Symmetry: C2
Subunit: 74 residues, 2 copies
Amino acid sequence: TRTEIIRELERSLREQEELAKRLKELLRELERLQREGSSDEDVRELLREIKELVEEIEKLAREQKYLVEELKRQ
Amino acid sequence: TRTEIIRELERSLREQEELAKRLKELLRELERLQREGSSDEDVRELLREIKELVEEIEKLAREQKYLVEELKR
């Protein structure tokens, strides 16, 4: 039972890494668009995707809390 | 101990929660700056802060993987 929870937790932590990396990429793009100028629509589109990723990152935190509690309760 | 490693994981997750909370807060501000207009400097300043928070979230993932590796053994 320990191993199965750990495998799921490890997947979740990998996902956290990947989402943070993607978020960094989008923020880099936003900085470029702001620096060289762009349409308001172009900025809003990046902000929308950035918002989605941050919401996904929040979800992972709740998952990981649950999985760590499972490991604690064994 | 398993107990002490779990406590470290609990700490790291609390830190992750707080960063996520702050990150949403700053993004709301960023949306305001774009919506209501602002100096380029104000936007760049906020983006610098947001970038730092995201780097910490990535750092915490690596810390948490390290702690889980300890827990497995």
